[PDB]
Structure formats: C-alpha cells, structure tokens
Amino acid sequence: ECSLQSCTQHQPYVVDDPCPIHFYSKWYIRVGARKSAPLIELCVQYTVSCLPFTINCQEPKLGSLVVRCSFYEDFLEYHDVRVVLDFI
Amino acid sequence: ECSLQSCTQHQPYVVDDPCPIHFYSKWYIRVGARKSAPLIELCVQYTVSCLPFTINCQEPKLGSLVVRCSFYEDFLEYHDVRVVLDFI
C-alpha cells in the first residue's frame, strides 16, 4: 500500500496516519528504492516532533518514509505503507 | 491516491492498472515532486509497449509515473494515481 500526502516544502507538516483507524503505528526510513531495504525506526532537520508525529515537508535523503501498521500491539501481523509527498 | 508496484529493475514490466476495474486510463509523466506539475502524456528506454502498457522497471528521470482514471470515456471527472516502484 501507498499514501500520497500534500504539504508545503521545507515547512512543518503533521503527517496523516495512513494506517486504518485504531491501528498501531511504527515510523521508519528505508534505504534505497529496493523492496527489502533496512529500516531506520523513528521516534524510539527532518523530524520535528513525535507527539504528534510531525516532519519538515521534504523527502529524506537516503530513502522514503514508511509506516508499519498492525492490528495487534506487538505486531503479530503488520502491513507497511510508503508515504510519498508532493509539494503545494 | 497512490500505487506501490514491485518489479525487477531495468527489466520489462507490465504495469498493473491502478484504476478501478473498467475505468478509463491515461498514462503520464509529471515534472518534479510538485502538486501542480505539467504532464507528459504517454502512448498517444522507459516505454516498452503500449498494448498492454509495459515499461522498463525504473523511475523516469524527470518525474514520477501517473495514471489518470475516470468513470467516463471523455473524462468529465477524473482521479489521478501516482505509481511508485520498488525493486525486487
């Protein structure tokens, strides 16, 4: 799955949670455009705040933002959602 | 809306139509990561075939592939869907 979000470049932006309502959230940065790339977990200048998760509206330099969604709190099954931005 | 498709880099790939079933299709290349960017219409080396629409599995150099979907043949209302690839 994939999420297209619009924001103003180089300005704070509260990222809309692409996961279904109630689903638990983990935010990552992947490396390269490659299917199985390593992930850098966020909230364990790009990152602005973690409460709520807000960023400066640009693409990170080494990968593309990713949200890990799960129906369960400890992620028995999870689904990833790439977050791609375009600039108004 | 957005579509994440997996393919093998630098190899022919038949793009899966992200539009709903039956919806009419126009394929474009936008310019830059900017919301209102000009569009280059395809099927009026990246492009491999138009029947069915197949490409070489990479990101185009100046923008990101886009599909224009419409319930009507002459596009009274249309919805765009960005196509983003990752590489297995």
Options 1.10.3470, 1.20.1250, 2.60.40, 1.10.357; CATH for A2-87 is: 2.60.40
* Backbone phi and psi for residue B20, each to the nearest 5 degrees, phi listed first: -60, 160
Task: Select from A68, A65, A86, A87 the least CA-distant residue to A78.
Answer: A68
What DSSP letter does each residue of B7-34 carry, written as one string? E-TTSEEE----SPTT-EEEEEEE-TTB
Task: Tell if the CB–CB gap between B35 and A82 is shorter than 8 Å.
Answer: no
Residue A6: both structure tokens together: 């619009």
End-to-end CA, chain A: 23
Question: Residues in chain A whose beta carbon is closer than 8 A to a beta carbon of chain B?
Answer: 1-4, 6, 33-36, 59, 82, 84-88
Nearest to B35 by CA among A66, A84, A34: A84
Tokens of B85: 């690839």
Query: Quick check: A2 and B6 CB within 8 A?
Result: no
Query: Is-contact A58 A9, C-beta < 8 A?
Result: yes
Task: Name, in order, each residue with C-beta under 8 angstroms of B57's C-beta and a sequence gap of 6 or more.
Answer: B7, B8, B9, B10, B11, B12, B13, B85, B87
Contacts (Cβ under 8 Å, ≥6 apart) of B22: none
Assess contact for B9 and B86: CB atoms under 8 A. Answer: no
Cα A60 to chain centroid, rounded? 11
Q: How far apart are the first and last CA of chain B?
A: 23
Cβ contact B2–A6 (<8 Å): no
B5 token code pair: 């498709």
Nominal resolution (angstroms): 2.6
**Residue of B1, B82, B86 with shortest CB distance to A34:** B86
What distance in Å separates the CA atoms of residue B11 and residue B7, rounded to the nearest whole number? 8
Nearest-CA neighbor of B87 among A68, A3, A27, A64? Answer: A64
- Domain parsing of chain A, residue ranges: 2-87
Amino acid at B29: I
- Planar angle of CA B23, B24, B26, nearest 5 degrees: 135
Q: How near does any CA of chain B get to the CA of A83, in Å?
A: 9
- Amino acid making up residue B18: P
Please give the sequence-ordered ranges of beta strands (E in DSSP) within A1-88, or none if there are none. Answer: 2-7, 12-14, 24-30, 39-42, 47-50, 53-56, 65-70, 79-87
Tokens 């419409």 locate to B70
Residues in chain A: 88
Residues of A in contact with B80 (CB under 8 A): none
CB contact under 8 A, A88 and B35: yes
- C-alpha span between B80 and B65 (Å, rounded): 10
Percentage helix, strand, coil, to 5, in chain B? 0, 50, 50
Which two tokens mark B4? Answer: 């994440």
The neighbouring-strand residues paired with A14 are A54
